[PDB]
Structure 1
Amino acid sequence: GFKVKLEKRRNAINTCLCIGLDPDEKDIENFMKNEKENNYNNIKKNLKEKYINNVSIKKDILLKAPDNIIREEKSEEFFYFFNHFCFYIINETNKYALTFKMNFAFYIPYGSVGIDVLKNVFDYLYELNIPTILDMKINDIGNTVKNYRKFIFEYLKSDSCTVNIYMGTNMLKDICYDEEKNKYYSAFVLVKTTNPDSAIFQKNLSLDNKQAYVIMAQEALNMSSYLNLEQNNEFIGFVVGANSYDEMNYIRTYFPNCYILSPGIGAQNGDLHKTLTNGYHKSYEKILINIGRAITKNPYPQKAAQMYYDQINAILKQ
Structure 2
Amino acid sequence: SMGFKVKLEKRRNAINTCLCIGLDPDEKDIENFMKNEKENNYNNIKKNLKEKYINNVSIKKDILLKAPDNIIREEKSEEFFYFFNHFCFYIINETNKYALTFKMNFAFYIPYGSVGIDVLKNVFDYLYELNIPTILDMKINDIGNTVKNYRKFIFEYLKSDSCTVNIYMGTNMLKDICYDEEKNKYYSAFVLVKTTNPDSAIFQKNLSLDNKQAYVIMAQEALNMSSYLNLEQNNEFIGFVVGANSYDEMNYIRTYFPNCYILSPGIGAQNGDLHKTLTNGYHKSYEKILINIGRAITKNPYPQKAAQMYYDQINAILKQNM
> What TM-score do you get using the length of structure 2 for normalisation?
0.98
In structure 2, distance between residues paired with 1:203 and 1:257? 22
Q: Secondary structure at the match of 2:58?
A: coil
The match for 1:224 among 211, 217, 226 is: 226
In structure 2, distance between residues paired with 1:169 and 1:271? 31
Cα RMSD (Å) of the superposition?
A: 0.4
Aligned length: 318
Deviations 1:84-107 (A, max 9, x none): 000000000000000000000000
Q: Secondary structure at the match of 2:167?
A: coil
Offset of 1:316 from its aligned partner? 0.2
In structure 1, distance between residues paired with 2:212 and 2:82? 50
The match for 2:260 among 242, 258, 261 is: 258
Offset of 1:60 from its aligned partner? 1.1
Offset of 1:10 from its aligned partner? 0.3
Deviations 1:257-295 (A, max 9, x none): 000000000000121100000000000000000000000
In structure 2, distance between residues paired with 1:272 and 1:171? 33
Offset of 1:301 from its aligned partner? 0.2
In structure 2, distance between residues paired with 1:215 and 1:56? 42
In structure 1, distance between residues paired with 2:54 and 2:182? 33
Q: Secondary structure at the match of 1:290?
A: strand
In structure 1, distance between residues paired with 2:234 and 2:250? 26
* Misfit runs of 4+, over 2 Å: none
Offset of 1:307 from its aligned partner? 0.3
In structure 2, distance between residues paired with 1:28 and 1:211? 41
In structure 1, distance between residues paired with 2:81 and 2:235? 36
Offset of 1:71 from its aligned partner? 1.1
In structure 2, distance between residues paired with 1:271 and 1:244? 9
Which structure 1 segments of 5+ residues have no match? none
Q: Secondary structure at the match of 2:76?
A: coil
Deviations 1:210-260 (A, max 9, x none): 100000000000000000000001000000000110110100011010000
Offset of 1:32 from its aligned partner? 0.2
In structure 1, distance between residues paired with 2:10 and 2:270? 30
Deviations 1:7-55 (A, max 9, x none): 0100000000000000000000000000001000000000000100000
Deviations 1:106-133 (A, max 9, x none): 0000000000000000000000000000
Q: Secondary structure at the match of 1:253?
A: helix
In structure 2, distance between residues paired with 1:270 and 1:255? 22
Which residue in the other structure is 2:122 paired with? 120
Which structure 2 segments of 5+ residues have no match? none
The correspondence of residues 167-316 of structure 1 with structure 2, limited to 5 A, is: 167-316=169-318
> What TM-score do you get using the length of structure 1 for normalisation?
1.00
Q: Secondary structure at the match of 2:197?
A: coil
Offset of 1:72 from its aligned partner? 1.1
In structure 2, distance between residues paired with 1:69 and 1:14? 40
Which residue in the other structure is 2:46 paired with? 44
In structure 2, distance between residues paired with 1:210 and 1:4? 32
The match for 1:71 among 58, 70, 73 is: 73
In structure 1, distance between residues paired with 2:176 and 2:57? 29
In structure 1, distance between residues paired with 2:255 and 2:208? 20
In structure 2, distance between residues paired with 1:140 and 1:43? 40
In structure 1, distance between residues paired with 2:172 and 2:317? 38
Offset of 1:6 from its aligned partner? 0.3
Q: Secondary structure at the match of 2:192?
A: strand
In structure 2, distance between residues paired with 1:279 and 1:116? 36
Identity %: 100
In structure 2, distance between residues paired with 1:92 and 1:194? 27
Offset of 1:309 from its aligned partner? 0.4
Offset of 1:192 from its aligned partner? 0.2
1:95 lines up with 2:101 in the alignment: no
In structure 2, distance between residues paired with 1:51 and 1:19? 19
Q: Secondary structure at the match of 1:317?
A: helix
Offset of 1:75 from its aligned partner? 0.4
